[PDB]
Enzyme design. Structure first.
Site, short mmCIF file in Angstrom:
data_model
loop_
_atom_site.label_atom_id
_atom_site.label_comp_id
_atom_site.label_asym_id
_atom_site.label_seq_id
_atom_site.Cartn_x
_atom_site.Cartn_y
_atom_site.Cartn_z
N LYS A 159 0.80 -1.22 0.00
CA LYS A 159 0.00 0.00 0.00
C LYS A 159 0.83 1.28 0.00
O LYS A 159 0.45 2.25 -0.65
CB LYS A 159 -0.95 0.01 1.21
CG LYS A 159 -0.26 -0.07 2.55
CD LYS A 159 -1.27 -0.28 3.67
CE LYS A 159 -1.77 -1.71 3.74
NZ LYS A 159 -0.68 -2.69 4.03
N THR A 160 1.97 1.30 0.71
CA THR A 160 2.79 2.51 0.71
C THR A 160 3.32 2.83 -0.68
O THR A 160 3.47 4.00 -1.04
CB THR A 160 3.94 2.37 1.71
OG1 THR A 160 4.66 3.61 1.79
CG2 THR A 160 4.89 1.25 1.30
N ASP A 173 3.07 7.62 7.04
CA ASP A 173 3.31 6.19 6.86
C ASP A 173 3.17 5.45 8.19
O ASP A 173 3.67 5.90 9.22
CB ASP A 173 4.70 5.94 6.28
CG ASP A 173 4.70 5.88 4.77
OD1 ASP A 173 3.67 6.23 4.16
OD2 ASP A 173 5.74 5.50 4.20
N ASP A 174 2.49 4.31 8.14
CA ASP A 174 2.37 3.40 9.28
C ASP A 174 1.90 4.15 10.53
O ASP A 174 2.62 4.29 11.52
CB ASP A 174 3.70 2.68 9.54
CG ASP A 174 3.93 1.54 8.57
OD1 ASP A 174 2.95 0.95 8.09
OD2 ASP A 174 5.11 1.23 8.29
N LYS A 228 -7.21 19.16 10.96
CA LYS A 228 -8.31 20.10 10.82
C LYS A 228 -7.84 21.55 10.81
O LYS A 228 -8.67 22.47 10.84
CB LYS A 228 -9.33 19.90 11.95
CG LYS A 228 -10.06 18.57 11.89
CD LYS A 228 -10.53 18.11 13.27
CE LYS A 228 -11.25 19.22 14.02
NZ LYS A 228 -11.89 18.70 15.27
N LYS A 282 4.11 -8.61 -1.92
CA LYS A 282 5.41 -8.53 -1.25
C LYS A 282 5.83 -9.88 -0.69
O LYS A 282 7.03 -10.13 -0.53
CB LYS A 282 5.35 -7.49 -0.13
CG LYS A 282 6.70 -7.16 0.49
CD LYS A 282 6.55 -6.49 1.85
CE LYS A 282 7.88 -5.92 2.33
NZ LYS A 282 7.87 -5.55 3.77
#
Ligand SMILES: Nc1ncnc2c1ncn2[C@@H]1O[C@H](COP(=O)(O)OP(=O)(O)OP(=O)(O)O)[C@@H](O)[C@H]1O
Ligand SMILES: Nc1ncnc2c1ncn2[C@@H]1O[C@H](COP(=O)(O)OP(=O)(O)OP(=O)(O)O)[C@@H](O)[C@H]1O
Ligand SMILES: Nc1ncnc2c1ncn2[C@@H]1O[C@H](COP(=O)(O)OP(=O)(O)OP(=O)(O)O)[C@@H](O)[C@H]1O
Ligand SMILES: Nc1ncnc2c1ncn2[C@@H]1O[C@H](COP(=O)(O)OP(=O)(O)OP(=O)(O)O)[C@@H](O)[C@H]1O
Ligand SMILES: Nc1ncnc2c1ncn2[C@@H]1O[C@H](COP(=O)(O)OP(=O)(O)O)[C@@H](O)[C@H]1O
Lengths: 42, 529, 40, 415, 107
Positions: B338-339, B392-393, B420, B497
């Protein structure tokens, strides 16, 4: 942390200033006067 | 003899026009009318911005334009001294001539300039260290009392330059001491064009510049280059072009007779861009090559759908006006890749500023540091007309562990408040986040902050697995047919992967044992859909 | 300290200069009086 | 009378070529052509890398190569002083001559050089820190204002040295300032051969080197040897040869080199041979198939990590019942690996440490592991690192997060 | 001269021979051959062990063996001072005589 400065205050003033003072110029004329009266006495 | 084009400054028309209007407008209009108005003159200017944008150059040029006395200069903390009461007299020694001439010649006196350099080194906020360091409370008081005190001066002009406009004393910036405040920022396309023309005019004058070099392409190519880096690029190109004619630098320096036919070609510019100069608010191709380590391959339908949904979000954030801040969450099972998709979306956005905030660079940091580093990355992104920031993560960023559970609260609050905060009026921002556990984020009340969600699947059918193998092409026809016969009549559950590592592990056996080992591994992994 | 030490040493030499000048003036005045007395 | 051969530097051809191209290529071209371009000159160089790789030597050779004046040297933090307003005076005294000569002459002036040593002990980041200790801010501001200020200087050159390129302020590393950054790293085979040739030239001239010693062999038997350990090897060999003539025909033979290599020089990025003697205390005994199975699997994993290009990072976990003999087998696999760089990170050398110290130690080991074309690292008895105890449970979170982050981080390109 | 026993140290048989061989073998050999070889001299050594086992004595004896000048004994805890730029000044005072004498007398 072990880190600090310091500031100094001066106790400095003594025998009159360097020969820019009038001591030498004052001394100058006495020898001329001595010459004059030596002449007169002789 | 003053002429604006002689100044040699490009991309700063509005700032100079404002400065001229506010500062020198009342010293050129006929005095008889100016007397009927009874208005005093401005006696201050402040300049601030990020490093390398053209502050000191502007100050120097302003200093040269005035037919007046030679300007005084102060390099940083040049005034400090170690004897009590001697670090202030140096302040008073700067205004003595102005005072005397104002006393003597009345209202027809000249103009005396002063240039403070790095003014945030001697003019920090008062009462910040329990009376300051003892010598940073008297200097400030003396400066304040001298600039505007009981006795009136009318023939000075003070300039200041600083990178950090937040620490300057507040009493020193009111509309009576330093009235004009200017921010010098990065240029846009026209500014880069003007800067390159200014710095290439001399070369083009003497026919030392080739004919295949086009300035417009260079202007388009360099995105978010500061003022000094264009000059650095030109200098590097010149040096590379000159280095050709030194043949025996190893043994003895010798110059040829072809030095007369010296010309600079576009290849030098391309090499200089590729190797030497690296910007600060731009982007470079190392990070993408570090995250997208094996490219992207179309092994099915889902990939195109994900990319299309990213493109739609990018277009919305580019065009819309009501919503300047949009965000999206990519989620899926582990080892799904996904990254890489987020990196691809960001790279295909083609925005000027694209940065990846990853936990790879926060090993051993406490909570306070994670929070402050996140804030800095999110502050750097408020100084560009467009941006895109990747997180990330999100799980590893909070230090989440299933036992307890246990995690960090301060970082979570920072994130929840930082999704926000709209940017300064007139700018846009896009935030992409990636996570592998949606339910945990749901329990923290964190799916309400994000605007939309996207799903990333695994390989879930034999035909897709065969297509992936064919695209990689590690197994040839016969072994592929055997694999198809074995797996074509079932369902599979595996990520890409993990497929790469399974293939690599399988390849290490003997030439006649690969397929059976691969099938054994694939059976062993287990489905548990 | 070497700078201050040497400059203070020159200052001490200068103190000796001042003492010599004063003593010379005093001796000149004494001889002055002697001759002036003698003439009468 | 200058030529490259006499500099005495080997293994740094490309770095020197780039430095020469970017820094000096415009001070030797005919002035007439230089003036028609109106290009200023570069004003700085920066050099960084691991210890003992040849930075100060390069700076010294650059300093004494040119026709310039004597280069001023600053030996670390020797400008600091305890009285308010004295450090900045010391900083300002370095540039005075350049300004005076510039004002007097103009474009015809000579060249000046300043050499800072261990620059990272003065110029730290100018963060807020709720108000930094002036030691940082005032000195850094003075230096920044002097290098490139309102008045123009065009006859200076500043060189720096540091082991920690991360700590230095960013405003001090932009074009127009110290803009030529170079990294000095460990040499490869050609570099070792060149260094050995450089350091054993005089002996060959006077016929003191025996005819049996072959340099090409020593270029191969030493892996991940820094620049500063080969000289130590040669010196130890010479000393061993000389001590044999104490109770005219002196000579140096291969046996001296072998003995000195085996007993005297201990590389820091190389393999250690006492760790395996300390951890494998009673050898390995073949009492059944499982031992052979485990060793074969380890061999396969090693071969994979050596030959593949899509899988640059590999991992494996050895687990079983207690008192079963895991550490010995892991050490045996590592020893049979035949990799230039092997290390062990055991918990018995961190007795009494807190969390952050353990994090720093692990990070330091992995940072070193990231500077060799191959590597192998063993983390043994994990449950002791995490500080686990069934009552509770209790353990350390920082160490676990650090390990989980480090288990999937790729090394620089190609390693 | 080695004679470890005559000097006033007993029980140091190998920890003396190894030192003499490795470090001091280029100080006593005829200068002509040393210059012909072109090898520099070791710049220091390290001694570690339990306290009260005879380290400082060995250092002083080594110093007396080579006709060296008076050693400058320094204690580690005593160099630290609480002002800025005082510890560094103390660390930088020990290397004055060597620099001056090399600058004057050459080699
Ligand atoms: N608008 C511009 N046009 C042309 N050149 C520019 C411009 N802005 C900057 N430069 C180049 O930048 C060089 C140095 O920039 P300058 O002295 O203005 O730095 P600064 O950003 O004000 O300094 P600092 O941030 O380090 O305090 C100038 O010599 C000039 O070559
Ligand atoms: N279509 C694809 N989509 C994603 N990754 C792909 C694709 N084709 C090839 N790859 C490769 O697969 C790998 C994707 O791994 P990635 O870094 O995205 O893992 P991840 O899902 O973030 O892992 P984790 O959940 O364990 O943190 C990269 O090598 C990428 O090059
Ligand atoms: N590339 C090289 N070629 C030849 N000899 C070298 C080389 N690199 C180092 N040496 C030898 O090793 C010595 C190493 O000392 P040097 O001052 O270069 O170390 P350094 O790595 O710069 O220092 P430090 O890590 O203390 O900052 C050099 O003086 C020279 O004797
Ligand atoms: N085939 C073998 N495998 C493992 N160890 C062996 C073997 N043959 C002999 N030994 C000896 O067994 C001991 C190995 O014990 P080791 O320290 O590896 O145990 P461990 O599993 O780490 O212990 P624990 O986790 O219970 O503290 C060493 O003395 C090793 O010499
Ligand atoms: N090998 C030795 N032979 C004889 N006396 C010794 C020996 N080692 C130590 N001593 C005695 O110990 C005394 C003090 O040793 P000291 O120099 O203080 O050692 P340390 O360096 O451990 O302080 C000496 O005066 C000496 O008489």
């Amino acid at each position: 942390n072990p880190a600090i400065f310091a500031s100094g205050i001066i106790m400095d003033s003594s025998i009159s200033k360097q020969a820019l003072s009038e001591i030498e110029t004052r001394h100058s004329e006495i020898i001329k006067l001595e010459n004059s009266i030596r002449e007169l006495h002789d | 003899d003053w002429n604006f084009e002689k100044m040699g400054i490009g991309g700063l028309d509005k700032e100079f026009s404002d400065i001229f209007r506010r500062a020198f407008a009342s010293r050129v209009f006929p005095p008889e009318i100016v007397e009927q108005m009874g208005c005093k003159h401005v006696k201050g200017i402040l300049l601030y911005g990020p490093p390398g944008c053209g502050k000191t150059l502007l100050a120097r040029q302003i200093g040269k334009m005035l037919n007046a006395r030679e300007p005084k200069v102060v390099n940083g903390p040049e005034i400090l001294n170690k004897y009590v009461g001697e670090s202030e007299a140096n302040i008073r020694k700067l205004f003595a001539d102005a005072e005397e001439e104002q006393r003597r010649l009345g209202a027809n006196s000249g103009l005396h300039i002063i240039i403070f350099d790095e003014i945030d080194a001697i003019c920090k906020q008062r009462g910040s260290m329990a009376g300051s360091t003892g010598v940073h409370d008297t200097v400030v008081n003396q400066l304040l009392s001298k600039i505007d005190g009981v006795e009136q001066l009318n023939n000075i002009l003070v300039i200041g330059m600083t990178n950090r406009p937040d620490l300057i004393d507040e009493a020193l910036l009111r509309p009576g001491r330093l009235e004009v405040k200017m921010e010098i920022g990065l240029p846009d396309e026209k500014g880069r064009l003007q800067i390159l023309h200014i710095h290439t005019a001399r070369m083009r004058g003497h026919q030392l510049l080739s004919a295949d070099v086009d300035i417009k392409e260079l202007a388009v190519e360099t995105k978010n280059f500061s003022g000094a880096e264009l000059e650095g690029l030109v200098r590097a190109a010149q040096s590379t072009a000159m280095n050709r004619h030194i043949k025996a630098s190893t043994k003895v320096e010798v110059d040829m007779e072809k030095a007369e036919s010296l010309q600079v070609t576009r290849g030098d510019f391309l090499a200089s861009l590729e190797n030497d100069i690296k910007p600060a608010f731009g982007t470079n191709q190392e990070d993408y090559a570090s995250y997208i380590m094996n490219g992207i391959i179309k092994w099915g339908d889902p990939v195109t759908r994900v990319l299309d949904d990213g493109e739609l979000l990018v277009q919305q954030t580019k065009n819309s006006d009501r919503t300047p801040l949009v965000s999206v969450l990519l989620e899926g099972p582990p080892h799904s890749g996904k990254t890489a998709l987020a990196a691809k979306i960001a790279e295909e956005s083609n925005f000027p500023f694209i940065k990846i905030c990853s936990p790879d660079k926060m090993i051993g940091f406490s909570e306070t540091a994670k929070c402050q580093a996140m804030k800095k990355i999110f502050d750097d992104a408020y100084k560009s007309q467009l941006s895109c920031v990747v997180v990330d993560d999100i799980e590893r960023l909070l230090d989440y562990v299933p036992i307890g559970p246990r995690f960090s609260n301060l970082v979570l609050q920072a994130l929840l408040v930082l999704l926000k905060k709209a940017p300064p009026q007139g700018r846009k921002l896009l935030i992409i986040g990636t996570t592998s556990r949606k339910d945990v984020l749901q329990e923290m009340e964190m799916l309400n902050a994000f605007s939309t969600t996207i799903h990333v699947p695994n390989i879930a059918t034999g035909e897709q697995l065969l297509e992936a193998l064919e695209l990689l092409g590690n197994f040839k026809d016969k072994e592929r047919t055997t694999i198809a016969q074995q797996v074509k009549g079932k369902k599979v559950w595996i990520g890409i992967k993990k497929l790469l590592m399974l293939i690599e592990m399988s390849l290490q056996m003997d030439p006649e044992y690969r397929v059976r080992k691969f099938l054994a591994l694939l059976r062993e992994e287990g489905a548990s859909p | 300290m070497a700078e201050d030490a040497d400059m203070r040493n020159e200052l001490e030499e200068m103190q000796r200069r001042a003492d010599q000048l004063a003593d010379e003036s005093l001796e000149s005045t004494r001889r002055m009086l002697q001759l002036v007395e003698e003439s009468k």
